[PDB]
Design a protein around this ligand. Structure first.
Ligand SMILES: *[C@@H]1O[C@H](CO)[C@@H](O)[C@H](O)[C@H]1NC(C)=O
Ligand SMILES: *[C@@H]1O[C@H](CO)[C@@H](O)[C@H](O)[C@H]1NC(C)=O
Ligand SMILES: *[C@@H]1O[C@H](CO)[C@@H](O)[C@H](O)[C@H]1NC(C)=O
Ligand SMILES: *[C@@H]1O[C@H](CO)[C@@H](O)[C@H](O)[C@H]1NC(C)=O
Length: 438
């Protein structure tokens, strides 16, 4: 009941919604001031979904550190009581890198939801599908296709025995690969340390108090600030790795107060903002490949790009068809942040304060949790309306209508295609990709 196909993960939302990019997808449809519904007189003629992979186990690296930290807490501490008792016996048995059962289901759900929302097209049109080449992203693509195909089969209006939807293109994450979904070739951006600095500066403003209380409660234990954030991370990973994802919040969660979760969440928005978003000088530049691919799709014309795009892939109709109506792309949070910013979507957002928490009003809709949670989705729609000769573009971020920037937006969040594309002059010029090397 608190976890559904349509509304996502609304369980314990006072905690679970502040885990940033470790938050399980939760729908923001009700938080949308503008209605997500197709307006009257309007028909959707195009839909692209860009999705993150689903909930996962910790990376092997982080998982070794979590697991070693907890042993140390077990070897050293003398008092494990009250909220701390569970820690004496806690037996680290999380897996590593792979999607969890819960994460698998999120993407099945996401396929169901995309199939249903665009049913008057998904009934007879097989989406053209791409995925960044990482096992968890690929597996996610296939779970999404699973749920989509299940729903098509049950739909009385679906044209049956069409080819299956499949992952048409797996884009390489190798270091030499031009990957629009998650670029790794911008040498100077790859070397950036802005995020780390910001992370440390902000963690120093709220973590030491927590560190202190933990050392106080667990006599014999001594912790770094970084270690405290590991036990904060465990609250998400120990909640959504288990069978009890829907019924029980991890015990890690209750070692920290709501106000500390607020800082945690904000910390997570900072890492993403200065790591991959407008805060980082080459962050939005990581999104221009995809933005140029998006424009080719919207205008049914050849990709004009010389940043992250692979030309062998994009100049062939087989691996980059221009008229497929429906498209699905699967990737990582960091690439999705860059793309969100390269598309102008958060150009109402002032650079985030590195010293003080900012609520979702101050940041004008930007947060890690609101943009790239586990199984995040972005939908780009093109629609044709009664009073207008031109197609109108509309964008939703996790079910929230996000008003376009760079073009004359109407009160429904939309701009004409031609003006939206013209607005994307930063991506059209290649953004700051020339600086990847000087
Ligand atoms: C572009 O894609 C092709 C086809 O998958 C591949 O073999 C080649 O490595 C890619 N080139 C770059 C620069 O990514
Ligand atoms: C546990 O004690 C060891 C050895 O004294 C020390 O080096 C380590 O930092 C302590 N760790 C924690 C998490 O308290
Ligand atoms: C890959 O991107 C680089 C850097 O933008 C570009 O110059 C090169 O020609 C591209 N290679 C392919 C196969 O698209
Ligand atoms: C968004 O603002 C950035 C901030 O520099 C600018 O480069 C970009 O062109 C703007 N994009 C749109 C669509 O307005």
């Amino acid at each position: 009941s608190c976890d559904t196909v349509d509304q996502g993960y609304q369980c314990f939302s006072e905690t679970s919604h502040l885990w940033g990019q470790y938050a399980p997808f939760f729908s923001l449809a009700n938080e949308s001031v503008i209605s997500p519904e197709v307006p009257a007189g309007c028909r959707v003629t195009f839909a692209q979904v860009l999705s993150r992979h689903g909930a996962r186990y910790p990376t092997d690296s982080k998982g070794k550190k979590y697991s070693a930290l907890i042993e140390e807490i077990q070897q050293n501490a003398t008092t494990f009581d009250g909220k701390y008792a569970f820690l004496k016996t806690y037996n680290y048995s999380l897996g590593a890198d792979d999607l969890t059962p819960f994460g698998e289901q999120e993407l099945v759900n996401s396929g169901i939801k995309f199939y249903q929302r665009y049913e008057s097209l998904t009934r007879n049109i097989v989406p053209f599908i791409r995925s960044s080449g990482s096992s968890r992203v690929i597996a996610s693509g296939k779970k999404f296709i699973e749920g989509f195909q299940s729903t098509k089969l049950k739909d009385p209006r679906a044209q049956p025995g069409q080819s299956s939807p499949k992952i048409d293109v797996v884009i390489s994450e190798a270091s030499s690969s031009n990957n629009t979904l998650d670029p790794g070739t911008c040498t100077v951006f790859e070397d950036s340390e802005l995020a780390d600095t910001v992370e440390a500066n902000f963690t120093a403003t709220f973590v030491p108090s927590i560190r202190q209380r933990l050392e106080n409660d667990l006599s014999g234990v001594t912790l770094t600030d970084t270690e405290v954030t590991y036990l904060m991370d465990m609250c998400s990973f120990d909640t959504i790795s288990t069978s009890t994802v829907d019924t029980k919040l991890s015990p890690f969660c209750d070692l920290f107060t709501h106000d500390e979760w607020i800082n945690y969440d904000y910390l997570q928005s900072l890492k993403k903002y200065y790591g991959h978003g407008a805060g980082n000088p080459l962050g939005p530049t990581q999104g221009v490949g995809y933005a140029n691919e998006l424009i080719a799709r919207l205008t049914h014309s050849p990709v004009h790009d010389d940043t992250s795009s692979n030309h062998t892939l994009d100049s062939s109709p087989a691996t980059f068809p221009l008229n497929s109506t429906l498209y699905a792309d699967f990737s990582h949070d960091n690439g999705i942040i860059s793309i969100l910013f390269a598309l102008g979507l958060y150009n109402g957002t002032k650079p985030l304060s590195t010293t003080t928490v900012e609520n979702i009003t101050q940041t004008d809709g930007f947060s890690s949790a609101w943009t790239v949670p586990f199984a995040s989705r972005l939908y780009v729609e093109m629609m044709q309306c009664q009073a207008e000769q031109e197609p109108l573009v509309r964008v939703l971020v996790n079910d929230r209508v996000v008003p376009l920037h760079g073009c004359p937006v109407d009160a429904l969040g939309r701009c004409t295609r031609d003006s939206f594309v013209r607005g994307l002059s930063f991506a059209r010029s290649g953004g700051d990709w020339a600086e990847c090397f000087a």
